Design a protein around this ligand. Structure first.
Ligand SMILES: O=C(O)[C@H]1CCCC[C@H]1COc1ccccc1
Length: 134
């Protein structure tokens, strides 16, 4: 058993709060905000050795990242930003920092009860997205 066991599985979005305002703060344009805001993604997390994979599948876009903790990688986000990402484990929370254009956003993923809680922060703006097992 190991590092991210409690994250692994297939998860479905059940609630979102403040996501439009997070996207605005990130710089996402009107049409993408509207369409992306409607999506109810499935997030699929798996681990093979040191490599963690997080897939998001939805009507808007499918994305996939594979990474080693602490090791920077290039990511194309659902909204089409070209970012440089680093993901670490900090006290049982996956902490994902994305850098692009002199800007930065941090996404935290944590297990709380039977949920996977995703908190997205851009300057002073936080969005909380809650997932349940699919
Ligand atoms: O819900 C999540 O896991 C978060 C991850 C961090 C970026 C914001 C969210 C993803 O947002 C998406 C919206 C529409 C389609 C695909 C992803």
């Amino acid at each position: 058993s190991h590092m991210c066991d409690a994250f692994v599985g297939t998860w479905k979005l059940v609630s979102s709060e403040n996501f439009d305002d997070y996207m605005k703060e990130v710089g996402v344009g009107f049409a993408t905000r509207k369409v992306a805001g409607m999506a109810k993604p499935n997030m699929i997390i798996s681990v093979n050795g040191d490599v963690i994979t997080i897939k998001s599948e939805s009507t808007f876009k499918n994305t996939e990242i594979s990474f080693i903790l602490g090791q920077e990688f290039d990511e194309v986000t659902a909204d089409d930003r070209k970012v440089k990402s680093t993901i670490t484990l900090d006290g049982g929370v996956l902490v994902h920092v994305q850098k692009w254009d002199g800007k930065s956003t941090t996404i935290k993923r944590k297990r709380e009860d039977d949920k996977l809680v995703v908190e997205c922060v851009m300057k002073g703006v936080t969005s909380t997205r809650v997932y349940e097992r699919a």
